[PDB]
A paper describes a structure:
We previously demonstrated that MilA, a CMP hydroxymethylase in the mildiomycin biosynthetic gene cluster in Streptomyces rimofaciens ZJU5119, can convert CMP to hmCMP12. MilA and CH are akin to the superfamily of thymidylate synthases (TS), which transfers a methyl group from CH2THF to dUMP to form dTMP in the de novo thymidylate synthesis pathway and, hence, DNA synthesis. In this study, we demonstrated that MilA has a substrate preference for CMP (kcat/KM = 39.2 mM−1 min−1) over dCMP (kcat/KM = 7.84 mM−1 min−1), and thus offers an opportunity to investigate the mechanism by which conserved TS evolves the preference for ribosyl over 2′-deoxyribosyl groups. In the structures of apo MilA and its complexes with various substrates, MilA are all homodimers.
The crystal structures of apo MilA, MilA in complexes with CMP, dCMP and hmCMP were determined. The structure of C-terminally His-tagged MilA was determined using selenomethionine (SeMet)-substituted MilA-L167M mutant at a 2.20 Å resolution. The electron density for residues 305–308 was poor in the structure of apo MilA but resolved clearly in the structures of all the MilA‒substrate complexes. There is no obvious difference between the structures of CMP-bound MilA and apo MilA, with the root-mean-square deviation (RMSD) being 0.34 Å for 634 aligned Cα atoms. The N-terminal three residues, C-terminal five residues, residue 232–238 of MilA, as well as the eight residues (LEHHHHHH) introduced by cloning, showed no clear electron density and presumably were disordered in the crystal. A MilA monomer consists of a six-stranded β-sheet, surrounded by thirteen α-helices and four 310-helices. Compared with TS and CH, MilA has an extra domain consisting of five α helices (from α9 to α13) in its C-terminal region. C-terminal truncations either from residue 235 or from residue 249 of MilA are both insoluble (data not shown). Presumably, this region could function as a domain to facilitate protein folding.
Numbering used by the authors:
A (entry chain A): 4 to 231, 239 to 305, 307 to 329
B (entry chain B): 3 to 231, 239 to 304, 309 to 329
The structure:
């Protein structure tokens, strides 16, 4: 169960569940194909994107979720802008609970703990440590009846092995067709972010899940993906927190349509090239959401991003 | 992750993997080890949870004591160190254990005081297909304790009802493939079976999933002997075993403190199912060893072998 890139693992697991499900059932009323205790190992976790056109993977959403996690926010307004359906998991219409990993990572409700800093500290004092774990799940989620937003991730673990930072995601449940695309993106994004911060190379990523499933309502789309390569760029070395802070300021201005960035204004930004392309994704997305003129911007993006935009919004960027 | 029938087959195969084909050699907290990352196995027959290789000297009395210690919800050192004196090295205050004490994590978790085992049985009663029946062990504050000598190695246990059978998954950040794996798999499949009996279900598959699976170099020679080197484990009776556990725990404490002793006849006369009388007999046999009383026929053969190999001068 070793794969070079996420895409190979993603398609192989999809084929497995679809053609040889262990179980067919309906947890919480939702008809599913299911396999129990499934995982994979990725040799190259930076290659985290799905580029199969039939899947229409949304790289803007992918970065938005990961940056939303890094922001530490539980606010619905940030993330529902990139995925409007996510408001169905908000009980109050302005925050999320188990969907919001950001608070779980940087200020966990069990103690207010910043687990990322404790992980950095643990691995600095003892590079070989087996303890560098970020707990996501909380014992009180199941204690409230009728909880509509229970975290699907149990924990993330980091290890330094031979100068490379390895990551492990443990989940109780995972949608193999939908959620897995976002989750592995964000977990290997955090893995890489942490590796640059520690001045390390990138090792393997292990994903392991209690219930992996495909909803029957997704079977047709899953089939077309099964019926149906530029590289993902490397995040720059060192501490990327200042750049994330700047990117997050632009995220909010573009999202609220308080600002627009021409192609020349994007290139003038005080940001490494990798993060300039992320802000460009948010300006492109602003054009869609606020119905501005599609833009030149496209030409300066890495090919992976251009393809994702072309396939997701073909009337805008095709 | 590969499929096995009994724990012993999985245990020996994994032991051979890490010993002969380690993925890494390193020394976390200064302890040199052989290691693989992201390793697990599935057991099709989790009740068969014991290691009977004589060179391993598996201690079935400790195995039951640990599992019952968990069911008691206790964090007390004096209970568990009586069966495993080395466990004292993980107690910072000489009275309690922290990450080693899974009992409180299951039944009164430090995040809110939550009884997660009750929440799990409620969750699976209301929705047997539930993907949410998770017992969290690990806690986010454990890494905030400066110089913590006892950080929980288990992240979570998960139970799933599939086709009338209770399946279990144990998720661990790290597991000693030679030592700890023996008692952890025993205790998790014990809890799995206990929960299945309570729910009126048969036993499904047990899945073991671990981040760092390792053999400490100080154990390498003993692991070699085990590698260079069958009676069935009995089933736990159907239904709610909590009243029987409560009565077994009363006797456990009396025998451990030498406040009582039980003859062969006194053991047969106990108001317990035979399965649990044998557990009390293991505690009485253990009392004879540790309190140096003078020294079995009613025991299942698996227990006889464990006693004969672990204390040959007494029961060999």
């Amino acid at each position: 169960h070793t794969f070079g890139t996420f895409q190979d693992a993603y398609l192989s697991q999809l084929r497995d569940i679809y053609h040889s499900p262990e179980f067919r059932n309906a947890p919480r009323g939702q008809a599913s194909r299911e396999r129990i205790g499934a995982g994979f190992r990725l040799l190259d976790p930076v290659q985290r994107h799905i580029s199969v056109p039939a899947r229409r993977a949304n790289v803007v959403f992918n970065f938005a979720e990961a940056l939303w996690y890094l922001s530490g926010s539980d606010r619905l307004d940030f993330i529902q802008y990139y995925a409007p359906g996510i408001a169905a998991y908000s009980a109050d219409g302005r925050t999320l609970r188990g969907t919001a990993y950001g608070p779980r990572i940087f200020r966990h409700p069990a103690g207010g703990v910043n687990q990322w800093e404790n992980v950095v500290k643990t691995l600095t004092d003892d590079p070989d440590s087996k303890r560098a774990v970020i707990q996501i799940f909380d014992p009180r989620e199941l204690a409230v009846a009728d909880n509509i937003d229970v975290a699907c991730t149990l924990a993330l673990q980091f290890l330094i092995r031979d100068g490379l930072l390895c990551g492990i995601g443990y989940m109780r449940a995972n949608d193999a067709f939908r959620g897995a695309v976002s989750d592995v993106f964000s977990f290997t994004f955090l893995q890489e972010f942490t590796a640059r911060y520690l001045g390390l190379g990138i090792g393997t990523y292990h994903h392991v899940v209690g219930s992996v499933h495909i909803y029957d309502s997704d079977a047709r789309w899953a089939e077309r993906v099964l019926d149906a390569r530029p590289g993902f760029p490397a995040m720059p070395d060192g501490d990327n927190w200042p750049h994330v802070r700047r990117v997050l300021e632009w995220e909010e201005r573009l999202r609220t349509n308080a600002a627009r960035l021409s192609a020349d204004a994007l290139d003038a930004l005080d940001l490494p090239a990798y993060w300039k392309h992320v802000v460009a994704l948010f300006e492109a997305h602003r054009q869609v959401r606020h119905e501005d003129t599609p833009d030149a911007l496209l030409a300066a993006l890495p090919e992976v991003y251009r393809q994702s935009l072309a396939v997701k919004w073909p009337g805008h960027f095709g």
